[PDB]
């Protein structure tokens, strides 16, 4: 389930956000974690630095490449429990939903 804030206090999270946003000024730092109630498998990687104009849909494909699911099985990515538009830019999602720490938090699930 969501664990990044469990495992790191605000100060460490903000410091990592500041560090990475200085090093990659045009990228959006995204934390992708399993939805609390889903039994879907683990994804290979939690932390993604995405181009600001990547679309949500392009990002869903990125995430789907880092999980092993039988071909009939669904995946969904949410931002604060909202299903974002595949045509939206990640920059717009970030503006609407970024955390106080500087990251964008998203969850993935086998259920919608």
């Amino acid at each position: 389930g969501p664990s990044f804030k469990l495992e790191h206090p605000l100060e460490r999270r903000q410091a990592e956000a500041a560090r990475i946003r200085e090093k990659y000024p045009d990228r959006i730092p995204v934390i992708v974690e399993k939805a609390e109630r889903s039994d879907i498998p683990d994804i290979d990687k939690k932390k993604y630095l995405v181009p600001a104009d990547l679309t949500v849909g392009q990002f869903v494909y990125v995430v789907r490449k880092r999980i092993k699911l039988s071909a009939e099985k669904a995946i969904f990515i949410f931002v604060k429990n909202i299903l974002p538009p595949t045509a939206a830019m990640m920059s717009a999602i970030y503006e609407e939903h970024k955390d106080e720490d500087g990251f964008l938090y998203m969850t993935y699930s086998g259920e919608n």
Binding site: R27, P29, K45, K47, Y48
Partner: peptide, 5 residues
């Protein structure tokens, strides 16, 4: 460790 997309 960040995945550069």
């Amino acid at each position: 460790d960040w995945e550069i997309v």
